[PDB]
Every structure is written in C-alpha cells, then in structure tokens.
C-alpha cells in the first residue's frame, strides 16, 4: 500500500494552465488504467518501463499531445514547455471533455505563446511582461510586436478531437 | 429536476437575532459556489455574499453594506443555503449565479441550465 | 466593484431591440484569458430570476438567438433581438472578476 499525489494530480478538481505548470514531486498502473487515451505512450522513454519525479500537470489540445516530446519544435515545445532531448519522461493524455470541458468553453485554461529567450528546458516564466524588448519597447499595447505573453483555448463539447481538451501530465523521472 | 426555494420569512422587531434557510436538490450542490441576494420591497437585488467550494476553500465575502452583520454558511445533507441574521436593522433570494465560471462543473447539465435561482422569501422587519 | 446598469428602468415594445448597457468602475476583463467576467439575469416578478448569457457572449441553453450580448474592458452590453410575452421580466447586469456585484438592475415591460 502507498498513495502519492498523482491521483490528486491527475483527477485535480482543477487543472493548472500551461504557462504554469502545477509542479508536484512504487505503482503507476492507475495513472493509466483510469481512464482510456489518445495519447499515453512515453516519448523518450518505454510505457513498461516507467513503473526525482516532477509532474507538471495542465491541459493542452489534442493537436499539441504529439508536441510534448523530446526534441520536438513548435508552439508548446519552444517557450510554453521546453524538454530536453535527454529526459526520460512520459506524457499521458486523455480527452476529458466530460470533466474540464464546460458548456460555452472553459476559460481558466492558459498557455504562453512566446518568449524571446528560446525556453531552456524546465524553466517557468510565469511574469506577465509584453512581449519582449525589440527596437521599441514602449511598455504598453498600442502597437505590433508587444502582446500579452498569454492567450487561451475554449473548451467546448462541440470541439474536435483534435481540438478538445487533455489533462496532460508531463511526468519527467530523474 | 433542479428546484430552488426558500422559507421562514416573516415579522420581526428590529435587534433579535435569527436565521434563514434555502431549498435544493437535482444538481451537484457541491461544486457550485452558490450564492444568496436580497432584493428589498420595490427595490433592486443586493449582493449579501457569496459561499465559495470547499474544494475553492470555502471562503465567505459579503458586501460593505451588510459587512459585519450577516453571515452565510453551507450544509451538505440538507443540499440547504443559510443566511442567518445578527442585529437586525431596518425578498431574499438563494442562488448559484455567478458560479459557472469559477466552479468545476463538466458539461452536462441537469436539463442544460447551469443556473439555480430561489423561489424568494419576504422578510419584514418591524 | 461598482456596477451600474443604462438606464434604471427600460422600456421596449413586443419584439423590438432591448439593449441594456453595463458599465463598471474597475476593469473586467482578464488580461490573460482576454475576455471579461460577466453575466446577465433577468427576474420575472414573483418567481425565481434566470441566467440570459454568460462571458458576455456566451449564450444559455434552451433559450433562442433573441438573446445577444458583447462586452470589452469595463464596458458591457446585453441586447435583445425581440421580446415575447414572457420574456417581460427585471434585469441585473452582473460582475464577477472580484466579488459579484448587481447593478441598481433594469426593469423592462411591454410598452
């Protein structure tokens, strides 16, 4: 008999949003037998193999599952959530569109579009700050290249697959 | 079927001390941070406070005018909304609006109306 | 957050356009989720009041187009494509970004 807090990572009341990561420090059956998937198996590692432990646990869309692995290039892969090619961890989705999705879209769900600093991997960047530097600065929104680092994803019934909502924990054993 | 109503209004002389009930059922009551307003004879709702989640950690805020009189709990299994009432001075509605964007609540829906509002309770004071 | 609604008392006829504007003192709208935090209930006289919309766009289930609504920053609107005859009810534009805070709330009747 032991408990960790997986279960309480994985059937989270509420998920934290991707710009940051709810980060949380033996049996790893139930985190895949609870719940049927698009996407479970390790990238990087063996879906046997798996049974320092950092899960990082928030949603992200289905399109993005492929996303989250090692030396993957894109949106979540460059400045949301950067992972070093040599990391052993395994990425674990499942549409849950019947728990986190809500009628109209749930809203509370966040991630970060872009940081100038390519992300160094397990680095969170949770400051607000406009987007970054460039020729002019200027502090405020009245013009190109200053946005908001954060944007976020509705999460509706009527959404596709693709597009529909997955508690992804980003488990990475060291 | 979702229904909300609300009893045990009625005279009372301005200083007791006393305390109102609401009735729910047919929805996960848990979840929802279920709040209670009152709207005074010919007036407009007030905002007496809302009771958030125990999962949200049940915090209780009210508003300045009622601040430090009021004082709205929770019970689970009665699915019951309290107002109880300290230094009375001279319709109360029990509800869940509000709620939705904070609550963790799936898409399904008793019927497919996520809001729960109360049949109202007159209260006259003396 | 002081919330107050435009006008205190609204008058439209059957089916024509019932826009009720909101206006608040602080900034609604979330920075990160870039939309805002508000809801729209109308109150029938009697009986318990009803969600309109929601997110200030989004749109309650089991209830038609007739009900339409935009908001952006501090400054929201909820407008009404026709009103039938239940649809005669009192409204109260509402805030959630910090506590919950219903106007002086609109009441609406057939002209």
């Known amino acids: 008999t032991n408990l960790c807090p997986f279960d309480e990572v994985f059937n989270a009341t509420r998920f934290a949003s991707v710009y940051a990561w709810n980060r949380k420090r033996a049996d790893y059956s139930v985190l895949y037998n609870f719940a049927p998937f698009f996407a479970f198996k390790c990238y990087g590692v063996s879906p046997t193999k798996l049974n320092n432990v950092y899960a990082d646990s928030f949603v992200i869309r289905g399109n993005e599952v492929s996303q989250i692995a090692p030396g993957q290039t894109g949106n979540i892969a460059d400045y949301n959530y950067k992972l070093p090619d040599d990391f052993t961890g395994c990425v674990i989705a499942w549409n849950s569109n019947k728990l986190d999705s809500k009628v109209g879209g749930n809203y509370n769900y966040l991630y970060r579009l872009f940081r100038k600093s390519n992300l160094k991997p397990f680095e969170r960047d949770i400051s607000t700050e406009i987007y970054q530097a460039g020729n002019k600065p200027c502090n405020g929104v009245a013009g190109f290249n200053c946005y908001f680092p954060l944007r976020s994803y509705g999460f509706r019934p009527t959404y596709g697959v693709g597009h529909q909502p997955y508690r992804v924990v980003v488990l990475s054993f060291e | 079927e979702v229904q909300l109503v609300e009893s045990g209004g009625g005279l009372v002389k301005p200083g007791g001390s006393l305390r109102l009930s609401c009735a729910a059922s047919?929805?996960?009551?848990?979840?929802?941070?279920m709040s209670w307003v009152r709207q005074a004879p010919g007036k407009g709702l007030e905002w007496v406070g809302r009771?958030?989640?125990?999962?949200?950690?049940?915090?209780?805020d009210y508003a300045a005018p009622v601040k430090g009189r009021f004082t709205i709990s929770r019970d689970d299994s009665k699915n019951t909304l309290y107002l109880q009432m300290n230094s009375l001075k001279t319709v109360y509605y029990c509800?869940?609006?509000?709620?939705?964007?904070?609550?963790?609540?799936?898409?399904?829906?008793?019927?497919?109306?996520?809001?729960?509002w109360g049949q109202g309770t007159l209260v006259t004071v003396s | 957050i002081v919330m107050t609604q435009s006008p205190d008392s609204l008058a439209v006829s059957l089916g024509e356009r019932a826009t009720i504007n909101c206006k608040s003192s602080?900034?609604?709208?979330?920075?990160?989720?870039?939309?805002?935090?508000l809801a729209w209930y109308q109150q029938k006289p009697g009986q318990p009041p009803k969600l309109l919309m929601y997110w200030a766009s989004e749109r309650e289930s089991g209830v038609p187009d007739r009900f339409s609504g935009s908001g952006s920053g501090a400054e929201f609107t909820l407008t009404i494509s026709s009103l039938q005859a239940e649809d005669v009810a009192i409204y109260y534009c509402?805030?959630?970004?910090?506590?919950?805070?219903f106007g002086g709330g609109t009441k609406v009747e057939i002209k």
């Open positions: 009771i958030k989640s125990k999962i949200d950690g049940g915090t209780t």
């Open positions: 602080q900034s609604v709208l979330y920075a990160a989720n870039n939309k805002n935090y």
């Open positions: 509402q805030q959630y970004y910090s506590t919950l805070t």
């Open positions: 509800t869940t609006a509000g709620s939705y964007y904070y609550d963790t609540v799936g898409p399904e829906l008793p019927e497919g109306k996520f809001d729960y």
């Open positions: 047919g929805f996960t009551f848990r979840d929802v941070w």
